[PDB]
């Protein structure tokens, strides 16, 4: 029934542009800057590209050709389009290298994403049928609910007081009648499990004389009831009586699309020296030294706290280009807020020299010249 | 004229307005696109081309085979279309079809990231040298920018301390 012109637009590339996703959720009860805004935690717009034959003309498959001054000259062509046509009859765009190249940097570390576990550093990947699942069915139990990562209900501890009242008066209250039916289906089994053995030596699930008989018996044990209320409202488990419920469930898939590797249990075979012990080190920046407590370091565009251990202790205007130290990325994971938290640990010494050998900056070569 | 209605108009309005106003185009995939790209925000950092070559890219898209198609790259769109197909032909649920198409997406993305590492390492075993990686190139740029900030801070710091000297009254020296 669709017209031929409308069938092409549906499959058009421009129509495939996903809607702008909400920004990384920050603390609602906190001040924020009004005008100046820095790079976000994760990208909210789609990064666009063209052929180098068309970029010379400013053609990006958009409403109008973009200016050549602000889109030509660089190596990697990347652009973000906030509005294809604004009230000023212009395409409000901006460079996309802030996030486009940060993905390439991270993926150059060759490190998978692991499931956060409170402090035997056993790492388990995210891409596993045991945990990475979203579909379910009524036979699911609470034990299996701890493996999922995508719940349809909110996290109580995270919701603000006002948001919690709206949830009760808009999602929990009108679900009273339906919840009674949920128990009827459960009590249909309460009767039939008395026939657990009647055959080895379900009813029609409508009994108002029963749903009341059950909940009144659970007022002395509030724990068993909460587990039953979570199944109906799809609430992520909170009390231990497991899947890192302290900070809440992730608002995104645990990987977040940054990197789809499953394990770092490989040994990069060096050309000459052979299989190495650790992974190649990475030079990191030093921001916000210790001496506003704590130290920060810029590791491949991401900000992670300094290693457990100097340049970090105090700020030194004498160093050129800032304090830069080599380090190895041990474990990386995504926070419940959507951020990418890297558990960074200081690197060794010999590996740094082994890396500089290929780069050529190694003042003293380890091959040949090294007598001992 | 009466514009095309891309969604059923409100059957309850007794005196509706905006009858001669074009309506919004909404497809079933719009719901799925939003759901996918929210679970994979960094999937947007992958540069995707929207410029069309000839507009005939839809003639060779048979989503019954799998995610990998002709003409289009492996993107979040391929997961949505594959999801939509299963959700319609094979009568799968939104969640079930999402898992299936989503898992096939990971296994393909993994192999692409493994090739880069194995390709470089393999090349060097036979005498293959490469240029500057994006990691080193990124740090060099930060150095040039950080230095410019050091100059500004140094200049501004001087101004503030000088202002303090002038602010304090040293008009008479005794």
């Amino acid at each position: 029934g669709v017209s031929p012109g409308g069938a092409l637009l549906r499959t058009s590339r421009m129509f495939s542009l996903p809607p702008v996703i909400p920004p990384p959720p920050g603390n609602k009860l906190q001040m924020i800057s009004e005008r100046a805004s820095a790079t976000e935690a994760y990208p909210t717009h789609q990064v666009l590209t063209t052929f180098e034959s068309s970029r010379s003309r400013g053609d990006w498959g958009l409403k109008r050709p973009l200016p050549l001054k602000s889109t030509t000259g660089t190596t990697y062509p990347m652009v973000k389009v906030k509005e294809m046509d604004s009230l000023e009859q212009i395409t409000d765009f901006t460079s996309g290298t802030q996030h486009g190249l940060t993905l390439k940097k991270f993926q150059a570390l060759n490190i998978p994403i692991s499931t956060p576990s409170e402090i035997r550093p056993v790492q388990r990947s995210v891409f596993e049928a045991d945990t990475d699942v979203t579909a379910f069915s009524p036979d699911e139990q609470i034990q299996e609910a701890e493996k999922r990562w995508k719940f349809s209900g909110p996290w109580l501890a995270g919701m603000t007081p006002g948001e919690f009242k709206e949830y009760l008066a808009k999602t929990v209250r009108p679900k009273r009648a339906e919840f009674r039916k949920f128990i009827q289906k459960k009590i249909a089994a309460q009767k039939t499990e008395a026939a657990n053995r009647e055959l080895q030596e379900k009813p029609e699930s409508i009994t108002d004389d029963e749903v009341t008989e059950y909940l009144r018996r659970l007022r002395n044990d509030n724990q068993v009831l909460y587990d039953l209320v979570g199944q109906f409202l799809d609430l992520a488990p909170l009390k231990p009586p497991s899947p890192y419920g302290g900070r809440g469930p992730p608002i995104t898939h645990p990987s977040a699309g940054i990197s789809y590797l499953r394990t770092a249990a490989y040994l990069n075979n060096h050309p000459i020296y052979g299989p190495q012990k650790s992974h190649p080190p990475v030079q990191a920046r030093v921001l916000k030294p210790r001496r506003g407590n704590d130290a920060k370091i810029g590791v491949a565009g991401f900000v992670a706290d300094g290693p457990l251990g100097s340049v970090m202790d105090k700020f030194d205007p004498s160093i050129e280009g800032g304090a830069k130290l080599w380090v190895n990325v041990d474990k990386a994971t995504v926070d419940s807020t959507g951020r990418v938290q890297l558990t960074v640990s200081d690197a060794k010494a010999t590996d740094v020299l082994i890396a500089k050998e290929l780069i050529g900056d190694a003042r003293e070569p380890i091959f040949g010249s090294a007598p001992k | 004229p009466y514009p095309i209605q891309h969604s059923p108009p409100n059957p309850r309005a007794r005196k509706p307005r905006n009858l001669f106003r074009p309506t919004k185009i909404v497809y079933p995939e719009d719901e799925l696109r939003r759901d996918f790209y929210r679970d994979h925000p960094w999937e947007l950092a992958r540069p995707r081309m929207i410029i069309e070559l000839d507009g005939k890219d839809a003639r060779f898209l048979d989503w019954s085979k799998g995610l990998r198609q002709r003409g289009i790259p492996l993107s979040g769109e391929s997961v949505v279309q594959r999801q939509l197909w299963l959700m319609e032909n094979q009568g799968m649920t939104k969640q079930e079809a999402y898992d299936k198409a989503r898992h096939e997406f990971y296994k393909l993305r993994q192999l692409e990231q493994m090739e880069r590492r194995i390709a470089v390492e393999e090349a060097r075993m036979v005498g293959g040298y490469f240029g500057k990686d994006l990691l080193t190139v990124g740090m060099e740029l930060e150095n040039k920018t950080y230095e410019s900030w050091k100059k500004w801070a140094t200049t501004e710091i001087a101004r503030q301390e000088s202002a303090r000297a002038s602010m304090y009254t040293n008009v008479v020296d005794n």
Binding site: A38, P289, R291 | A153, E156
Partner: peptide, 21 residues
């Protein structure tokens, strides 16, 4: 030892220009 604090007297100064957390 004042040479040390004299160095920190400038460290806090530069850190005050880092208007970002």
């Amino acid at each position: 030892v004042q040479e040390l604090l004299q160095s920190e007297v400038t460290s806090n100064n530069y850190m005050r220009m880092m208007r970002r957390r």
